[PDB]
From Swiss-Prot:
Pathway listed: Cofactor biosynthesis; nicotinate biosynthesis; nicotinate from nicotinamide: step 1/1
Source taxonomy: Eukaryota, Fungi, Dikarya, Ascomycota, Saccharomycotina
Active site: D8, K122, C167 (nucleophile)
Induction statement: Induced during the stationary phase of growth, by calorie restriction, by various hyperosmotic shocks or by low-intensity stress (at protein level).
Catalytic activity: nicotinamide + H2O = nicotinate + NH4(+)
EC number of this enzyme: 3.5.1.19
Gene: PNC1
Biological source species: Saccharomyces cerevisiae (strain ATCC 204508 / S288c) (Baker's yeast)
Protein name: Nicotinamidase
Length: 216
């Protein structure tokens, strides 16, 4: 069956008042809300995801001496004895747990609360980045996502939300790797990068992982 995953539709990403606004992100609120309620889409289940960071999170530039937001940083595997590394971006503080910024945007939250929609939080471990809604960048900690999808007989995963080139892409790739027929509905996503070229690049990467990219 089909599960819709709505990725990180949170204030810090969507509102201009947010600390890490996705350009044109406000355009997604109503259409995604409509998508969630559209019976023609045959959603057996909907899952919404949230970045759920502590203020001391390793991904915030603020928590690093002599490093400013949007700078590059070398992350180190948290497993002891493992010494591999990954290139990453240090960010402005965003989606801190229990703050306005980490709240699902009103219109989505309203749906989640009244329809009792499953929430998956990621990014709460201080020591690592966590783009994918399925597991951290090391594939060390997993969320309950996969188990939830399995319980609910999911064979098709549809992904919408923000940011196209980060949490959306990472979640889509996880879903495909785990054997779900995965689709990204492009029109229901936005990149953080105000660069039109970024859309094409992601499109190609997704297709290379056998993920369907359609507009609507
Ligand atoms: Mg802003
Ligand atoms: Zn984040």
């Amino acid at each position: 069956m089909k599960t819709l995953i709505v990725v990180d539709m949170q204030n810090d990403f969507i509102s201009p008042l947010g600390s890490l606004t996705v350009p044109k992100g406000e355009e997604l609120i109503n259409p995604i809300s409509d998508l969630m309620q559209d019976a023609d889409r045959d959603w057996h289940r909907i899952v919404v995801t949230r970045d759920w960071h502590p203020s001391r999170h390793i991904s915030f530039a603020k928590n690093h001496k002599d490093k400013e937001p949007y700078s590059t940083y070398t992350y180190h595997s948290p497993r002891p004895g493992d010494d591999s590394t990954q290139e990453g971006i240090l960010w402005p503080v965003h989606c801190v747990k229990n703050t306005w910024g980490s709240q699902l945007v009103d219109q989505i939250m309203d749906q989640v609360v009244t329809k009792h929609i499953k929430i998956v939080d990621k990014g709460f471990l201080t020591d690592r980045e966590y783009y994918s809604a399925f597991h951290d960048i090391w594939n060390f900690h997993k969320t309950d996502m996969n188990k939830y999808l399995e319980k609910h007989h999911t064979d098709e995963v549809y992904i919408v939300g923000v940011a196209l080139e980060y949490c959306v892409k990472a979640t889509a790739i996880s879903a495909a790797e785990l054997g779900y027929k995965t689709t990204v509905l492009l029109d229901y996503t936005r990149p953080i990068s105000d660069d039109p070229e970024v859309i094409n690049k992601v499109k190609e990467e997704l297709k290379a992982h056998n993920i369907n990219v359609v507009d609507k």
